[PDB]
């Protein structure tokens with residue numbers, strides 16, 4: 001009951017899904033052949049980990065997932081990789097040509113050729129569910145697939161599953177670690193197209209992840225693997241309430257109730273601690289107070305913005321590991337008395353706390369250190385609108401000259417779609433401005 | 441309760457309608473672009489036919 | 502992921518033969534087609550340019566075209582000659598005599614179908630074709646006229662496939678033939694319209710490099726083709742070797758061409774060292790040096806719309822990021838500000854043969870204007886006096902067709918100027 005189907009779209013989505021499912025397996029004690037000696041319920045069960053894993057009669061635990069990319073390079077690595085055994089081949093779907101960083105190809109030209117099959121496979125996954133709860137969609141803003149095909153899939157899922165929850169984990173483009181200069185265009189387009197079909201979206205700025213990997217892990221030049229492992233840790237913290245369950249656990253929907261004051265204001269800012277190397281972690285046990293403090297240092301945020309220059313509409317803390325309410329409340333009191341936590345006048349200032357007891361694990365030989373406790377803060381703040389502004393600026397610089405626009409028009413699009421998406425983005429920016437104004 | 445159902449159904453219907461319209465419009469636009477480009481190349485072949493025809497009207501002189 | 506190679510004419514066939522020599526060396530393929538390399542990374546993307554023939558042979562997906570038979574016999578005679586498809590040699594007898602009309606309209610028109618049949622066969626065995634590349638020259642007749650035409654017919658039959666060209670620019674410094682400006686303008690008229698990317702290989706830039714920087718008072722065509730082969734190996738490096746970049750020609754073209762007409766690139770290579778007598782900062786400047794450019798243009802006389810830099814060799818990629826950011830910020834005035842993050846940079850950890858590390862440079866700069874204005878100048882010097890027009894009107898062409906090509910090229914130059922003068926506000 002209460003199952004969740006993960007959909008990983010494009011290169012970024014697929015590789016992040018690899019990280020996430022490997023980490024889930026390590027967390028639940030599932031082997032790469034799908035076996036779990038812990039589970040004595042053969043063939044099924046209502047356990048918490050079954051929200052993300054189905055079971056076969058042979059004892060295999062299969063991710064409730066489907067990976068989709070318009071070209072086979074990335075998913076072929078999964079098919080031949082260490083966890084090739086976990087997935088039924090039908091869960092891994094590939095086209096032949098990709099979207100070439102073009103939203104039009106992902107949404108219209110190439111996406112239409114494979115959308116029906118993807119929906120059929122998603123339906124096959126959903127038909128196994130006794131009470132499906134929603135979808136988790138992993139994708140990048142910048143890629144032609146991750147933008148266009150993700151948008152098309154979200155529209156179609158809205159059609160075929162009604163208002164059933166669809167959460168997003170979206171990769172916000174870094175200005176200097178990207179393959180494409182047209183990523184502002186795709187970002188604006190897909191944000192416009194999916195805004196009505198997403199109930200909650202967690203943006204991850206690759207620049208923030210890159211800076212965190214460099215500063216906290218002393219990695220000269222982080223790779224996609226480093227960023228993806230950190231992102232997997234964040235996703236695991238967010239989904240642990242779904243996959244584990246205990247006395248103090250708070251279910252992600254309960255946080256979602258607080259985090260979304262209006263349908264359009266559904267972009268939480270995620271912060272994660274501790275991110276620390278093995279070398280620095282030795283003889284440096286980190287207390288609840290210390291990681292909670294780190295949660296409010298902006299250098300640990302998933303998106304580069306300044307919360308202190310905006311206003312909070314919600315603040316949730318998701319602890320996992322050796323944590324008890326006494327220490328959490330003490331740390332929160334110190335932070336309240338020593339930081340700039342300015343709430344909008346129309347919502348309460350309390351902090352919503354959940355704690356999972358299962359400690360965080362780490363990929364063997366990874367750069368992140370194993371720790372006894374960790375925390376992820378999910379805050380609804382106006383400051384995240386900066387991430388929009390920045391992007392909306394880059395867009396504006398190119399579209400004034402129609403730079404690269406011919407590549408989209410050539411694939412069937414009209415300038416009207418560009419203008420409509422940009423106007424929607426401007427309305428979103430002013431909505432974020434408005435929510436922060438004080439009442440009369 | 442019936443209003444809730446009506447709004448869910450309305451959302452689904454208009455999602456479907458707008459997506460169908462978008463895909464139809466995109467198909468029409470891409471088809472027109474290709475067609476224009478194909479006819480341009482054909483007119484180019486034509487100019488080529490004309491000039492090659494012309495070459496035969498000067499040698500007979 | 503398969504590309505189909507077409508070389509047309511003397512220059513095209515010769516520099517294409519050298520290109521195949523170089524990349525076969527890099528991929529560990531011998532003149533017979535067998536693989537004897539010591540790295541499986543040499544073959545992960547071998548199908549990009551080779552078919553796997555029965556008996557574990559490797560054969561270039563290449564297509565040799567000419568209205569003269571001498572270049573095919575020479576190509577077979579030279580190194581790796583026996584590796585090409587013997588049925589892919591499409592030949593003629595009558596030649597074109599440095600006449601654009603004879604290559605485009607009359608004789609090349611007779612041979613074009615013969616060439617297209619071979620192209621069709623090669624294409625129909627591709628699991629997923631990504632596009633074509635053409636090596637040819639603009640000053641000749643066959644490579645010029647027949648390549649432009651063959652490009653148009655391929656676009657007819659493959660309208661949604663990438664067409665790139667390595668086009669060699671005529672220069673008085675290397676070729677005596679006067680009428681080359683006519684052929685260059687006529688072929689540019691076509692290229693502006695039917696290609697996705699044209700890498701302007703300038704013979705004036707090549708001779709200037711070979712003389713002033715390589716110390717060759719007399720360089721042979723082989724000396725220039727050494728540079729050209731190095732450049733072509735660099736430009737194709739990303740597609741030929743595994744890395745952390747998932748890009749076919751359509752992705753790279755999307756990132757490099759902001760306006761359909763302005764797709765004429767300024768290649769660059771470093772290091773350029775003579776046989777008589779290297780750090781990432783030095784590679785980086787040398788690569789941005791106006792005197793490492795393969796087009797006779799000064800980038801500091803224009804502004805970059807987009808730039809791509811491919812480094813080859815084991816190096817500190819942190820240092821690469823540092824030096825590229827450095828050049829960008831210390832030369833900000835030469836990068837248009839309405840295209841944020843318009844400089845992309847790739848690293849391949851395997852150098853080319855003979856060097857510990859090289860730096861290939863692709864640039865979409867409005868300074869290419871200088872090259873196009875050069876040609877145009879020569880063009881008008883004849884057309885205002887209608888010199889040699891009988892060579893072309895004899896084949897059926899009209900005089901206003903020359904005028905259209907001249908005005909189209911002038912329009913292209915005026916367009917490069919427009920976006921060079923544009924500002925954000």
Ligand SMILES: O=C(Cc1ccc(-c2ccc(OCCN3CCN(C(=O)CC4CC4)CC3)cc2)cn1)NCc1ccccc1
Pocket residue numbers: 177178179180222223224633634665666698736737739740745746748750753754756757809810811845846847863
């Ligand atoms: O376009 C051509 C010639 C050509 C044009 C452009 C490019 C190109 C090069 C770099 C680039 O971005 C660099 C990618 N970033 C990606 C991830 N990075 C990380 O650090 C990963 C880790 C997390 C931090 C940084 C790097 C984009 C494009 C290459 N080549 N085509 C070839 C051709 C022409 C004509 C005929 C045949 C073939």
Ligand SMILES: Nc1nc2c(ncn2[C@@H]2O[C@H](COP(=O)(O)OP(=O)(O)OP(=O)(O)O)[C@@H](O)[C@H]2O)c(=O)[nH]1
Pocket residue numbers: 009010011012013015016069070098099100101102140141142143144145146147171172173174177178179180183206224227228747
């Ligand atoms: N964090 C992270 N981001 C990635 C990764 N791979 C790609 N991206 C993001 O995606 C953008 C580039 O587009 P891709 O994801 O590579 O392309 P795609 O989604 O597969 O769709 P195509 O453009 O058609 O290839 C960049 O802006 C990156 O931020 C990854 O492995 N990890």
Ligand SMILES: Nc1nc2c(ncn2[C@@H]2O[C@H](COP(=O)(O)OP(=O)(O)O)[C@@H](O)[C@H]2O)c(=O)[nH]1
Pocket residue numbers: 510511512513515516597598599638639640641642643644645669670671672675676681704722723725726729
């Ligand atoms: N770089 C280079 N250019 C060449 C070579 N051979 C001919 N060219 C150029 O091409 C022009 C003549 O074209 P050509 O190669 O004869 O093709 P064709 O006339 O159609 O057969 C001249 O302007 C030369 O600069 C060569 O081996 N290398």
Ligand SMILES: [Ca+2]
Pocket residue numbers: 039041044045046047050
């Ligand atoms: Ca169970």
Ligand SMILES: [Ca+2]
Pocket residue numbers: 675720721722
């Ligand atoms: Ca000579």
Ligand SMILES: [Mg+2]
Pocket residue numbers: 010011069071098143145747
């Ligand atoms: Mg991809």
Ligand SMILES: [Mg+2]
Pocket residue numbers: 510511512569
């Ligand atoms: Mg010749």
